[PDB]
Nucleic acid binder design. Structure first.
Ligand code: ZN
Lengths: 112, 55, 115, 69, 96, 100, 68
RNA sequence: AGCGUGUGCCUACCCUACGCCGGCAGGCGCGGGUAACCCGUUGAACCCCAUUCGUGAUGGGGAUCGGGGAUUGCAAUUAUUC
RNA sequence: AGGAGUGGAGCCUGCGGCUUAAUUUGACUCAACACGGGAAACCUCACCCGGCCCGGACACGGACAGGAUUGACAGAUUGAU
């Protein structure tokens, strides 16, 4: 549930994945994101409002979880980020061949 | 009226009492282990839950 | 020629008795039709039908009542009363006799045609 | 002779309701009476017996190929 | 779409107490489980919610069976004007 | 005071490493310890047809869920148990404690 | 679009003109008179002016009938 | 015998040993299991042993049909099932 | 080279065809026919008979607090109270 929701929500700022860690009285969720500036919004607004969504929909005591996000390392290796970038570049007006060549050269230059 | 017709026919059993939690359909639902998910959606999202192919 | 007896008893003595002995008088499957509890879930229409049948008619064949149901049990308290049964499409007129006691209602329906 | 009633063939008949074991010609006569009663009732079982089809609720699309021609 | 006066103000108070709002996609479920202190029809409140969407005051999200609603600056202006309160009131999502 | 803690996880190496770490810590604390009891694994099999439609050769899928349940017995006071639970927490292990 | 079998109409509420004038009878002084009934129910007080029937009167929200 | 499964989210519906009523399904006051703890040593069937049956559509086949008694759900007719 | 067999007998099931107010449909040699996880008494349901509150947001021009609304008890077709 959480993975699908985060993939659909944080697609606008380069979503990669999530790693839910469970700890009594304090649940620490970490989000695999590529663009940390767009995921925080305006000084932590996004974290608080998505947390409120979490308690309101899932149902959980308030003030116990804390949504987290950090810049992912070696983003060229994660295929999900490249697929999302290709979706962005093919969305508006880019040619299929040129865009595919660009993503291919970036992937093979990433170290794969 | 229709407000009385909402909770009129018993939605206790049969097949309309339950539905898939992904697409709100009522075919191929897996009630095993309380999945309540149809076969296609379970096949689609099986690896994320943890069920993976070893045999 | 030979006066019928319902399964041991005759019409008047059968009528002058309640369900608490009627149930043992007839068979088992229709006993559960009233043994689980009072019938009020979808039997408001059935009770309305009973009231309509017990309404005093003129000295002739009584009036006809149209219903969308085919799930009534034939009790003696409505024999000799005309009812319109919604046999899928039309409220077909039916004819009953005092030998109908203890049976179902919607068994007088022809599926398509004799062929 | 202390024989329980459930062991008998037909019990609590529609005619008299008494419990009696019936013999060959008696069974044939009672079957005729029951089928005539169903015919007079014009019940579903009686009419399906009249055309001579399966009355318990079976299928005919693939069953009953040795009857009418 | 006839809406009693008390239900609308109750839903406005429930929405403004935080920055977001949720509801399940099931019209055959009158009582709202989170708002257990009132017999609000969930179908009416979600339909008024999406009508407020159609007038364009909030963002809409929906994944499998639960909708997600998020406030906006113009949306919070509309809410504060309907509630007849000064703009000094802030939701729980804007505080540190 | 016969404390019995139950550990359930899907991965086997992580569970074995966590149990070994707990045993080493208890031994360094110089406390009586029991043997790590390994309950029989429970397999969850959900076999479904692979065809979204109903056309083609009848193929099938085989899904498995190998779960494990390792547990140890201790005769320690609960304060050290709470101190241990306050450290070395990972998502793989869902600790369940039974007091006896 | 149109159908084959004709359909009836939907019920409409006629314009209620001078409702208050129909509730209280005007006298030649400050005194007032009433020609309707008052609801003795616990949920609703005497503010619910029942309809002016001729056989038996009907309440507003109670769905109850008081006979003569 | 060996794989399984088991008290629920809108969801009540689980496996049930134990002692009775009755040929029989079936009916209540009685307990555990959220499971290597309880059903459960899962006393399975096919096997094995001693009569009955004796080439006879016959002690195989149970196709068709009537009546009676039962749990299920608001509801069993074209019998849900036994 | 062999074993079990099917096809012949009875019974359950899908398809085609005839019938039916309706008997919904997808797939037609391997690679369609106990296949859609579909063993359909009500929901299933997507077909016929019938009548229901509408589950027509919102923008514009009219209709309105001097009432635009909205829920109905005796009784009649109706299916219900
Ligand atoms: Zn009143």
């Amino acid at each position: 549930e959480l993975n699908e929701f985060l993939t659909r929500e944080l697609a606008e700022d380069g979503y990669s994945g999530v790693e839910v860690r469970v700890t009594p009285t304090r649940t620490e969720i970490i989000i695999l994101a590529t663009r940390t500036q767009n995921v925080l919004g305006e000084k932590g607004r996004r974290i608080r409002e998505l947390t409120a969504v979490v308690q309101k929909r899932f149902g959980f005591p308030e003030g116990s979880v804390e949504l987290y996000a950090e810049k992912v390392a070696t983003r060229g290796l994660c295929a999900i980020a490249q697929a999302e970038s290709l979706r962005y570049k093919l969305l508006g007006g880019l040619a299929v061949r040129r865009a595919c060549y660009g993503v291919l050269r970036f992937i093979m230059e990433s170290g794969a | 009226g229709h407000q009385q017709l909402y909770w009129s026919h018993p939605r206790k059993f049969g097949q309309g009492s339950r539905s898939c939690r992904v697409c709100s359909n009522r075919h191929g639902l897996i009630r095993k282990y309380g999945l309540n998910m149809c076969r296609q959606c379970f096949r689609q999202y099986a690896k994320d839950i943890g069920f993976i192919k070893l045999d | 020629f030979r006066k019928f007896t319902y399964r041991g008893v005759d019409l008047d003595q059968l009528l002058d008795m309640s369900y608490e002995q009627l149930m043992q008088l007839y068979s088992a499957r229709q006993r559960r039709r009233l043994s689980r509890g009072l019938r009020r879930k979808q039997h408001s229409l059935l009770k309305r039908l009973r009231k309509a049948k017990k309404e005093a008619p003129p000295m002739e064949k009584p009036e006809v009542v149209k219903t969308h149901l085919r799930d009534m049990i034939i009790l003696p308290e409505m024999v000799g009363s005309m009812v319109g049964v919604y046999n899928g499409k039309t409220f077909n007129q039916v004819e009953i006799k005092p030998e109908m006691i203890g049976h179902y209602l919607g068994e007088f329906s022809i599926t398509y045609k004799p062929v | 002779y202390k024989i329980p009633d459930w062991f008998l063939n037909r019990q609590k008949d529609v005619k008299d309701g008494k419990y009696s074991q019936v013999l060959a010609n008696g069974l044939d006569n009672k079957l005729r009476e029951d089928l005539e009663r169903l015919k007079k009732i014009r019940a579903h079982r009686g009419l399906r017996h009249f055309w001579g089809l399966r009355v318990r609720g079976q299928h005919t699309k693939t069953t009953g190929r040795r009857g009418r021609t | 779409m006839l809406m009693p006066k008390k239900n609308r103000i109750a839903i406005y108070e429930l929405l403004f107490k935080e920055g977001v709002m949720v509801a399940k996609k099931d019209v055959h479920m009158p009582k709202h489980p989170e708002l257990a202190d009132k017999n609000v029809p969930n179908l009416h409140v979600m339909k008024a919610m999406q009508s407020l969407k159609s007038r364009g005051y909030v963002k809409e999200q929906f994944a499998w069976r639960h909708f997600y609603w998020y406030l906006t600056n113009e949306g919070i202006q509309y809410l504060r004007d309907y509630l007849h309160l000064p703009p000094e009131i802030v939701p729980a999502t804007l505080r540190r | 005071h016969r404390i019995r803690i139950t550990l359930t996880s899907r991965n086997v190496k992580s569970l074995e490493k966590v149990c070994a770490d707990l045993i080493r810590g208890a031994k360094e604390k110089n406390l009586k310890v029991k043997g790590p009891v390994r309950m029989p694994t429970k397999t969850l099999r959900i076999t479904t047809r692979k065809t979204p439609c109903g056309e083609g050769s009848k193929t099938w899928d085989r899904f498995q869920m190998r779960i494990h349940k390792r547990l140890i017995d201790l005769h320690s006071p609960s304060e050290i148990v709470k101190q241990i639970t306050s450290i070395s927490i990972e998502p793989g292990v869902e600790v369940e404690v039974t007091i006896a | 679009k149109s159908y084959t079998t004709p359909k009836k109409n939907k019920h409409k509420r006629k314009k209620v003109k001078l409702a208050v004038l129909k509730y209280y009878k005007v006298d030649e002084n400050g005194k007032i008179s009433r020609l309707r009934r008052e609801c003795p129910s616990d949920e609703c007080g005497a503010g619910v002016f029942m309809a002016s029937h001729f056989d038996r009167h009907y309440c507003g929200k109670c769905c109850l009938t008081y006979c003569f």
